[PDB]
Design a binder for this molecule. Structure first.
Ligand code: HEM
Ligand code: HEM
Ligand code: HEM
Ligand SMILES: [O]
Ligand SMILES: [O]
Ligand SMILES: [O]
Lengths: 682, 679, 323
């Protein structure tokens, strides 16, 4: 149990009487009043201590990544990696370290939709025996900007306009695209956010990236440059934008429920921890500066080397005390790892320490149960708001004769202390510049786009088309066009069509045809269909429900989560048509006999909105999901104009439908149903 | 061990390596720099996590009673008091409850002197098995004001002037005496603060009071009116003002050191808890309203009934985490006790809960180790800054089928719940007024002044003369005299002399000659002299130090703390003359042969300020202490014009001096040395 | 008037009726009660709004230098110093700039005595036309330690023992002299603190120092190493320790009252701003490293150059809001 250390602070209220926060049993359902219908007394200490705690429940949301969810788990190392790092948690085969991971979006506030289009956070804490080590990552390997001092500008431009606070959780407005086109470094991450990475199917279907080049350091002090990767064992998978939008309204907790259900049902998700390793003397040897956070390292140049695997198997007990209160920091570093001169990472180190003082209203936030290490804290820090400990050492200073030198200094050779990479040097003038090696803002965006499938490329273009069409200012849109044209003339011309702007002329300085692996989502089927959702649309009339039950039981044998849907909650029905939507499922199957609710009287009922079963089937097909119908229910396929032998469409008896649906869930999205530019011309 | 429950939060750094606040061994004595003589790097996470915690160490001090100190201990009940209270901590003979007590001044800020003249706080927390019960009291049984809405007015007027923040920890300025005379209710507590209660010898030599009338409630709801009293087993003792002034500069920590040393040396101080009990129908029977916090109940009408004893025997381990962080509340009430309609108490219940939000910057301050009860907390409160627990009940609301009714409601008949006194009634118009029964502001100040000894009365008069002479405004000084003349014409006349104002003619409306017991300090000797301090003035020349060591060993047999003083720290010397002052001791005795440092070359040395041994003896004599000299050292007493004929002065051989000094310490202060108006 | 810009936030209550913090005239000398001898009602918004502000009056004292006092004034440049610095406030003869100065102790808390033996702060703000420039200095030209990461160790050692919080505003205890003897860099400032600098007669009778070497830079990038000096026009003066001990008890506000009285009586104190100017290539040429804050540069090697004069002529109107 990864939460084992947290059980000492867990409070069980069952079987007990109500109390105040300072003890004493009470009743707290009536205010103390001066007379039968009199005014409430100031001396009602019970009322005041109850309402004051309610009044003070909220803490500030995170300044970025305010919307997200998390879970506990275990990380297991696959070997003794002392040959590359002194990091304790990687020092032996099958060594296990408790983790907590929080996934998130970036721009939206606390109550915004999971399926907004956005970069996604992927923050992992290792509770190692030599301190907490945090990898505060994203599901995209490059970031918008090259210097941390520009972070407020980026975030202000993509967060709501400061006059009306419109729009929520979205880059589709003037200020954001004004910034993307005025700061061309941002276009690489923008392309990633405009792809499937911006609308993933779940937290469990994302890769993770530390983005920055870090350093692994051995006991003798030798170092190597390193990139952190998390590779999902569930496979990468993404939605389509028109589906993500409906899902934002139908279930804004789609992603956090996904992770919770997967863990509750015993299908804990896993990611493998992998690294790219680079010699120090090759930091600038691959066509870009490895200090540049707007660049990723093509796997053709440095392949991923798996070090271990992380499994998230325990949900939190109290979301606020654990998920909301946890405080990640890239400054949470340990012996065996070091920073680099990445100007974006450099400022992060200051920013995450500082912002905790705003979120937690004091300096003792590492004493919170979810932030505490398991390795012990011994120093001369004292006092501060909410000090939860009572220190014994009264000589709280160093050096000291009176405390005998304890707590004692630890460094590279004594006490396994942290040490900066010994060979690191500084050379040159103090400057407020960026290295000229950071100047190329277009080559890698072109590289990313080249490496996507044709329909995947169309998704990127259609996302940009959707986003840029919200920009009111004409010049901003033309500025966007000029910047896009430096990535690819074809992308600019296809985006320009939606904008009503003239197709720009080629500017080939950065054009190229190179491609790289690992970057696509839709060119690979899932390695497993466990936890994937199947909506079975049935009816309470006739014998349809009995068949849906058998259809459900066999589908569950393969590890799928099946929801039987009908007019009302008859025996065996999991959900009503009124409460059902196609966004909640990865495949839709119409049970035999349920074709009655797709036409005629059966489709017009007071118990669900008009056309709901037809709409669920239409949404699922148009959003590329595997859809099916058993036996006579093929008439439902007919009523929305879907043909039986289309790709990802399955009609027949129960068993062939079951096999066809499960095969289609591996494909996940059938991209034959999405038009590409040039298809419609006569 | 009263601190037993605090064991699990203690952190031991012995033999450990230095770490960050998130773990990981580090060194933290060098900043990370870019080159040999280079600038510090932002990426030095070690530096910023160490300095950030230092930068954020301070929390706001208490809005009042900022200066103070405390200790842990045990309360033991003397009996089963269920016939008067349902309170669990008083429900069985020999039942023990851990306590923590904080003593304080009122006006001064965190770093002000202990021996400022002020009302003194005396706050006790009982960690009962049915919740935390606080009696947030003072060492004076009455308060300045009758309605809690006036507390900011009182406190602003006493605290430093808002333009220059002058003066520190003192009532001796214009605005305070402008309030005292404009708000005549304040005259009673003023007289108490102008008495020995304003300059107590130590926290251990104070009585304590809850001030307010509260209610004790039995199981069936029948209530009694109650006054809380703490009776010190050490006896009450006070300084004189001219002595307390010097001590404020020589040792501003005089009182917190005295409490620490008493516990550290195994001389734990003790207080008996006593109550005055009054039937509900006698609330207005004794010449005043018991809802009025500017009056006390004379013990002739209701004797003190002792219910148990409290002993403070454990010092804190970290001052800030324990003493500074503890959050007292009169609203911390338990089953068997209830409030009364005292308009001062009523507002306190609001203001102590509210002020913790400022001092602790969050709603979860009761989760701090020093504030946690021992009895268990089960409710549906959640979240808040610094939430330190993880609740299991996901149905955090009532009523509810899903949580099966838990946590469940508790009331008078089920669950041992708190319950307001069943018979209390409201009646009349909603009003912003005070009862006319509150209108006498002069009788009880007169009663208090009557019940003190003549020199004790003179101390009060000389306190007033000192204080009011600091008031620059002439009309305020006349306003003060006009109000003092309402209490006693003789008091006003004697104060008027110092102010150069005319003796006002008698205003006899509230004059009376009644006296009451239990309010005097100087009319009673001390029950014990254990822990009292003796400074032995000696010299490294000759054989004086040998005799001082013998003198010390015999005095220590009586539980006295003895400091041998000489020019330098020779073998057997506890303190140099340079560091010594008479304010630190309760008796001064000159060892034989030490008269050499009282005149001539022995008095002129680079090792101490000129005349310092003579100043200590002069100070000790003039401040009413027992002073003595052994053998030839009587020349030192003659050198300052003091003769052995006098009370509190002892000479002769060693055993003669020891028995005399130990006798004199019981009297403590010799009031023969203080002149009285027209004596 | 140095305080001229603060007039528009000044609030006059003479002749007015009592109000709440959200307006509306009120009375606030009686709690609202349910009957003649009744309990106070929660609906008394007047009471709660008045006590909530009182309950929330205090803010944390400064982690160091908590005990001090201040005043407003004017700094006037003696010349056009553009040949050594581009600083606007030194860019013309007779140019005037508003200032505020806070003097302080170091160790003691908010209510500690002014005549404790201690290092003393001398913090000066110039409200220049190109931003606020602060010289946050002390009355002693050298500091205890050579690296800022050791500051919590120094301060923990000098401030009271964490078990009983004894002693107040004093280095005369075990932990302080443990650190002084274990960290020998501290002995320079120690010796200064043991001299008259530790018990000055008043704030007006102190010199001031920036301690650190800084840089003055011209418009074209030319730099010189600089040490800041404040030279009191009233003369340096100190007490004796047996006197300062009694004064700590007789008047804890001795220094803040002395500064207040001098300004209010028309006797405004003044200091001249003076600098030592060192070439960059001589940073290590005078028997020590000029980056080392435990060393001062003897004036025989570099005499002072007077840049201007500052005079403190305006007391604050509200201590809390200003000082
Ligand atoms: C490669 C670049 C970056 C990555 C991968 C990244 C990732 C993240 C993630 C995953 C979180 C949420 C952690 C959680 O779930 O609690 C977060 C929060 C945050 N980030 Fe970043 N971020 C990056 C850039 C930056 C920069 C450049 C800054 C500022 C200079 C910054 C400042 C913050 C702050 C202040 C928070 C809030 C943390 C808190 O309130 O606890 N981020 N970031
Ligand atoms: C009989 C009248 C009073 C007595 C005996 C009394 C006593 C005390 C004592 C002993 C303390 C110090 C607690 C400690 O040691 O931590 C204290 C603090 C305090 N008192 Fe009073 N007081 C009285 C009246 C009032 C009134 C009328 C108010 C406001 C309406 C008030 C507001 C406060 C506040 C806000 C604190 C600070 C509490 C904290 O920050 O923990 N007091 N009082
Ligand atoms: C040459 C060395 C130093 C000098 C001349 C100096 C001077 C001062 C002065 C005069 C003040 C009070 C200003 C006021 O009246 O508000 C002050 C406060 C302070 N000092 Fe220093 N100090 C020195 C060393 C340090 C170091 C090394 C640190 C930390 C690394 C530090 C941290 C602080 C802090 C946190 C405050 C509180 C300021 C506030 O609360 O606004 N000091 N110092
Ligand atoms: O971030
Ligand atoms: O108080
Ligand atoms: O400082």
């Amino acid at each position: 149990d990864a939460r084992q250390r947290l059980k000492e602070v867990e409070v069980d209220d069952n079987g007990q009487f109500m109390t105040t926060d300072f003890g004493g049993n009470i009743e707290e359902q009536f205010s103390l009043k001066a007379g039968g219908r009199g005014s409430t007394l100031l001396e009602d200490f019970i009322f005041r201590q109850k309402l004051q705690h309610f009044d003070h429940e909220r803490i500030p949301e995170r300044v970025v990544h305010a919307r997200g969810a998390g879970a506990h788990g275990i990380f297991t190392s696959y070997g003794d990696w002392s040959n590359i790092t002194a990091a304790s948690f990687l020092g032996a085969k099958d060594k296990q370290t408790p983790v907590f991971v929080r996934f998130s979006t970036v721009a939206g506030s606390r109550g915004s939709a999971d399926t907004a289009r956005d970069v996604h956070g992927f923050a992992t804490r290792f509770y190692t025996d030599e301190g907490n080590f945090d990898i505060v990552g994203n599901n995209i390997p490059v970031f918008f900007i090259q210097d941390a001092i520009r972070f407020p500008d980026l975030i202000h431009s993509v967060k709501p306009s400061p006059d009306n606070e419109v729009p929520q959780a979205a880059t589709a407005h003037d200020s954001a695209w004004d910034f993307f086109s005025s700061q061309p470094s941002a276009l690489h991450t923008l392309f990633w956010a405009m792809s499937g990475n911006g609308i993933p199917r779940s937290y469990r279907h994302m890769d993770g990236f530390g983005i920055h080049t870090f350093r692994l350091v051995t006991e003798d002090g030798k170092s190597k440059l390193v990139k952190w990767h998390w590779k999902t064992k569930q496979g990468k998978a993404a939605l389509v934008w028109e589906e993500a939008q409906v899902l934002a309204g139908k279930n804004a907790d789609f992603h956090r429920q996904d992770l919770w259900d997967a863990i509750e049902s015993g299908n804990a998700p896993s990611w493998e921890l992998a690294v790219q390793l680079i010699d120090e003397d090759k930091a600038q040897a691959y066509g870009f500066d490895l200090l540049d956070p707007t660049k990723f390292l093509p796997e053709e140049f440095a392949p991923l080397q798996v070090l271990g695997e992380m499994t998230l198997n325990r949900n939190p007990m109290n979301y606020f005390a654990e998920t909301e209160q946890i405080s990640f920091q890239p400054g949470h570093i340990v012996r065996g790892v070091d920073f680099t001169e990445d100007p974006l990472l450099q400022g992060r180190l200051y920013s995450y320490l500082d912002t905790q003082l705003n979120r937690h209203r004091g300096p003792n936030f590492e004493q919170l149960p979810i932030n505490r290490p398991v390795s012990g804290v011994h120093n001369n820090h004292r006092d501060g708001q909410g000090q939860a400990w009572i220190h014994k050492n009264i000589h709280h200073y160093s050096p000291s004769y009176l405390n005998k030198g304890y707590p004692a200094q630890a460094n590279q050779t004594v006490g396994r202390g942290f040490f900066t990479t010994p060979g690191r040097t500084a050379s040159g003038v103090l400057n407020r510049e960026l290295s000229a090696t950071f100047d190329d803002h277009y080559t890698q965006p072109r590289l990313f786009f080249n490496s996507l499938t044709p329909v995947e490329q169309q998704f990127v273009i259609n996302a940009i088309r959707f986003e840029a069409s919200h920009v009111t200012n004409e010049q901003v849109k033309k500025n966007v066009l000029e910047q896009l044209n430096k990535i690819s003339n074809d992308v600019a011309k296809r985006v320009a069509v939606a904008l009503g702007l003239e197709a720009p002329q080629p500017d080939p300085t950065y054009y190229h045809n190179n491609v790289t692996r690992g970057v696509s989502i839709f060119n690979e089927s899932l390695p497993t269909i466990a936890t994937l959702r199947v909506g079975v649309l049935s009816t309470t009339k006739g014998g349809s429900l009995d068949k849906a039950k058998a259809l459900k039981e066999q589908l569950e044998k393969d590890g799928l989560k099946v929801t039987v849907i009908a007019e009302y909650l008859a025996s065996g029905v999991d959900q009503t048509y009124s409460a059902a939507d196609a966004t909640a499922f990865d495949a839709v199957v119409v049970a035999e006999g349920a074709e009655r609710v797709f036409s005629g009287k059966g489709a017009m009922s007071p118990l669900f909105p008009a056309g709901r079963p037809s709409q669920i089937l239409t949404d699922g097909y148009r959003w590329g999901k595997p859809v099916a119908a058993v036996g006579s229910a093929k008439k439902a396929l007919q009523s929305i104009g879907v043909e039986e032998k289309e790709a990802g469409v399955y009609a027949g008896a129960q068993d062939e439908v079951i096999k066809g649906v499960e095969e289609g869930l591996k494909v996940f999205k059938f991209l034959e149903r999405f038009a590409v530019d040039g298809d419609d011309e006569e």
